[PDB]
Amino acid sequence: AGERIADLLSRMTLEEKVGQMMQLDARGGDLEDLIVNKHVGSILHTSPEDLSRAAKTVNEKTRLGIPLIIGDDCIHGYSFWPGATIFPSQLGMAVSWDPDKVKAAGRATAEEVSCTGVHWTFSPVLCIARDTRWGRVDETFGEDPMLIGELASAMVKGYQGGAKAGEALPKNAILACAKHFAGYSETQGGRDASEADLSHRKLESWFLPPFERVAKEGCGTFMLGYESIEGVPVTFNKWLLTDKLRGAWKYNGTLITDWDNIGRSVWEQHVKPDYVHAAADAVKAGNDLVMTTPQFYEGAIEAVKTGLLDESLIDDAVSRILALKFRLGLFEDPRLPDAERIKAVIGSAEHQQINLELVRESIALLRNDGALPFAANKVKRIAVVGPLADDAQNQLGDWTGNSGQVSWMPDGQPRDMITTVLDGLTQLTADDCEVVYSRGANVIDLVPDPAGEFYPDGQPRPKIGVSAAVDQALIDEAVANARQSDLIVAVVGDVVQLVGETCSTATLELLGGQNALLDALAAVSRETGKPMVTVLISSKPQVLPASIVGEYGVFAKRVSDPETGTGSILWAPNPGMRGGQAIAEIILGLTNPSGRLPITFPRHAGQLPVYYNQIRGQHGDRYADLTQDPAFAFGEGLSYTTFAYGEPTIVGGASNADGTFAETDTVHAEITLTNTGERAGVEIVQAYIGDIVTSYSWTDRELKAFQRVALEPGETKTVAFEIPVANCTIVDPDANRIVEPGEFELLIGHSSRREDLKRTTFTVA
Amino acid sequence: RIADLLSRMTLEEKVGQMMQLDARGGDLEDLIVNKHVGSILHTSPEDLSRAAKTVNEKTRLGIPLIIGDDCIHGYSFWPGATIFPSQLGMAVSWDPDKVKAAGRATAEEVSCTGVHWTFSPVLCIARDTRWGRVDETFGEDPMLIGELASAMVKGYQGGAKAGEALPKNAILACAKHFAGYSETQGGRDASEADLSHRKLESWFLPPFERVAKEGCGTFMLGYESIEGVPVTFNKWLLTDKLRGAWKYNGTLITDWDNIGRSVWEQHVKPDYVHAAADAVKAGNDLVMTTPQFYEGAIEAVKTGLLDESLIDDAVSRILALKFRLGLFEDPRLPDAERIKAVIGSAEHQQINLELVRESIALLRNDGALPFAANKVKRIAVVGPLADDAQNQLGDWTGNSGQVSWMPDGQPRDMITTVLDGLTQLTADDCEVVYSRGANVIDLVPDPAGEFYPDGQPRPKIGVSAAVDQALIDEAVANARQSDLIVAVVGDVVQLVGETCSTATLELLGGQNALLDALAAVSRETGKPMVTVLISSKPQVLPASIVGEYGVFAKRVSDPETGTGSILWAPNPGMRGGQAIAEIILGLTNPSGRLPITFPRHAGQLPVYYNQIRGQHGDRYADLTQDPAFAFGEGLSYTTFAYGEPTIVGGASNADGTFAETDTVHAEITLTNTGERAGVEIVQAYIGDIVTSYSWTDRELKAFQRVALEPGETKTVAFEIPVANCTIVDPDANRIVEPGEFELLIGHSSRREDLKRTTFTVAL
């Protein structure tokens, strides 16, 4: 009850086995008294007004006063807090390739969260966007393990204020959570929790590296994934939990299952016969906290009383959980909400500035047909058209109220200052040149659920969004507006009903009348010469009409080429509260774009998979009906200037004489970059390593380094890279990551496309 | 000769023991046989005579050649041979006896020409419809593939279980492509296969194990790299499974230049010396079309990298095969009289007709089928596939491209197109007017360059043809002047096979616009319409035919969905137009069922019926997960009523539960409730209710073609061994797990078409 050494938490001697259900984390709320009179150890989804009462109920109505560990989903900012700073999604953040600003966003988020009673965020997401059909692509940092590792490492440091494994969590910091460990992101058909046919070798190859990095850097907690991997759900997966996480990585953080993993193993996966055996196997597998599985309670108790489960294992789990709670000082200070600090830091002008500076880089200029940027004073009227041009809530995207996961913010984040594209462009960022909005099209029509208007409990079944019908009236109005304007700004994308859990998409196409809208607008632009720009605000890459990207035949033109299709192309994944202002600034030349793609755009769903790091061995390089050239490749993106690369050169680091490089050495390389245009810009220099010959089939190149490089007009910089030879690895059939002697190529340049890369070589022996 | 096991003889010179090579023939046999090859493939008909002559007259030791070639669905590249439907079309029939008859006839035609060996049947499983080689498979189900492949191996080898006395009218069978070649990344040709041991055992190995233990003559190792290891060097597949657990005693051969591809294409081996050494160490026998193996293996021995005794053991296995076939006494020279007697004989044509009559699936009947003959007076036969004989035959049939000695393809006089099937109607002059309607592809030169492959020209690449509104207008006028509209669409050989996977699965060219206009005419005038799909694999059809897709969509087989009736004939062979015509006119009742699932969109993949449990939700936010047509679907011209299935015995435990060694006996009644006789393919699926490791919810385990006269009822009886009700554990062990099982018997894989009972397994 006082400061003796934490080892004497062995005074767990008082917990009845009934109370050793400190392992449960239950959905609030809100009947905290019942939930806390249940010997629960954690609660999630606690409403802002009720975070005050939790620790009060602990201190005043419980036998032992064991403080709660309180967590919630603060996914890209304090998602479900009204008025908090809502940053871009993780995918949008990854467009920036800026670890420092992602870390700043994590620090600001933790600053806002740590003064409200929440100790813990279920973030960052380390899943890898390997299948564009997956509904949660917006939550990832893209399709590359290295980039995911860099950004996730930065954001864990931002959340936890630099605290490592075993240290005091600062008052303005929160616990980070690595999810979803592991392999949740490449399942059959891109479906939500379908089967993952991911061997140990493939998991180690493309899924584990970022998890291993943040685990060895002291990420506070880990969340176990939904899906069954090779017949075994992660909750019971010994190789992932024992051999990798606790074993090879020596991870000492706390684990928690995803939403009702144990129950789903029974009723959804048909893997466990009942909740008794499911609970027993979950405890035997080394689980710590159990999220939203009530039947685990009676499941574990009976499992012990029937001799199926040794109670000492439960004692060890409670020991780990209580170790986490004592480490955070919760027994002395449960970190109650701070009204003054809530008024002072949540939504502060400083956090708004951090959000703006991040989102200014979170937008990718994919094509410039020559008309960008537009000059304000040279025009008099701009047609802002498209259902995403003034949709604030869907601009924020999934995992931000009212996205659906909670209900205490039914109107979403306050409209008072979400900056939409209409608000920013240019109804804020230029004088009285007219800015006329036209909806142009609908995205989805809401139709009654075909299985009845009510659930069996009398509650009404919500309507289902389907691809909206084409409304020719909105197209005609949008066309008239465009013809009466000097510029056409089309804003299209998806909505939350098309994103997230259980909401994978198969076609990847824009729904509703958006394709017809873009067709008509492109027709007007071609006919009259009016400049046009298509702004895509979507949770993930989308298939655009041929009028915009060109036909995808057996042979097809490079989509980013200025003469392909009609108009310019900008991508802004889910740019947060300040996204419209940054989009406006880029369109008007106030801000130079500096985003690059962290994920590949497919031309068609049948092109999948389209990630840049393909495995060698294919016979041919085309489908008989579709080019294998993606619409936009990993690393693509443009500025408002031009850059010239010199040739890359190895400058040192090799210790053999020779040789030339040994496994413990580090490759030092240099390449010149020159701003050959008329305005300053930022080029994201990308460094890829390719193992020319491998004993086991592998990809031909992998991202290993990158740098955001700023250049004034005419300025040249020497970009220098340090790549450890220990990072130039492949994986063997037994999932061992090894450095293999032989020849390696180093490709440095503009994108993952080999035509955008300059090449040198080095040898490892 | 009189000796028994003294004959295999290392007088070879010093490595003439490169009997392990199998090189591409055409047309320099003397060099090839003096390269001391042990086998040749792609030998032209005129040259099959000269091979064994060159062996007997110009070689030092006179080791006879083992001669093989691709006889994929009939004697593919022999002019005038009986060309049966593709393996996928054959699988539409669900008729193992007729598939075996086709293999027996094929072997009869091949075994009199000098070829001893066919690279057939294909045991790959169509797990991704994007794959270019789906036409060569028996569908998407391991059990059906095992049944049909077993039957066709028995047909090829004349029942010889190897054995092996190979009869004079039989040829060696080849199980290909072992294994996992059919589910690679993106459905592309030999891209990476992320197939663990457990997944391989689960969905890919069963048919290979079956034909291996039944004595399939040879095995062919697949192109692709499995989990980083190409099959040519895959110890678990070759040693642990094939040679070890299965105790297989047949002969192995790599696919086309596997060893070289490991060097220049997969970048897995540093040079041909190490590639050859690793291939020999892995237990390979014959090496297909890798010349650099020669100097590659010799050097590997001379540098001590490869033990020569391993080569001696490989040569021992090959020569054991050659002695067992009696090639040292009779090399099986071509027989001009037997060629004149059996190749293309009327008996084989009849077998082909009886098979193809069942190889056609009636997928939707809007009510107008079958059409009555004497009541129609003009029919518009429209579509680019309505009279395309060569593309109706499909891939792996000259002129498909793999050989060059038949540049004009199989003789047109022997191919009945759908247009040709105007012989039946009505019968002499109700007019049958053909309209091309649309083009499929335009031929463009290969970028970049037409050589060096090497001096020979590189074939043109097909691109999606432009919509031709003039042909659409002509077809529309023809349709408006007719009593019936028969639209025949599909793909062509340039869109199927090796290096020719497809991503969109849609018809190319103006076929979609053509079908739209024809459907508009049919709706406007009430003229009946039928869409005949002649394509190598399932295709995505326009919304005018299958209905609009979306979050919710109508059942495509429902009579009121879309416009017109829908027939599928994958690649129906020489008698395909006659069978399609007979079915359209009611002369033959359709009895085909789908061996593969039709997706509505490529983004729906995978769509095979045996999905793994665990998904959160059951729809994409923009597309239903209901496929266009499910595995086992198909209709007849009558109706059937099912009773409830019942377990009737077989349990040996002393509490009524079933034991692992038992066999489940079940019965269900089937009644022809219509006005004409028909054949219903009764399907029996097993579902393990609870499994220790995630599994599918149902698997096909039995099926029977049941014939019924009007009003007739039969008791269909099934015997399903409990040893077949298995799952696979993390260590790739196929095990029977005690617990509750459901038995679903009925019309298709859709649970709404299945009736359900249960049984329990214990101990």
Ligand SMILES: OC[C@H]1O[C@@H](O)[C@H](O)[C@@H](O)[C@@H]1O
């Ligand atoms: O709400 C907490 C959890 O809910 C689940 O539905 C999601 O899969 C997790 O990403 C999330 O952390």
Ligand SMILES: OC[C@H]1O[C@@H](O)[C@H](O)[C@@H](O)[C@@H]1O
């Ligand atoms: O023609 C011989 C071989 O050629 C290869 O390209 C195919 O993959 C094999 O199926 C065939 O047996």
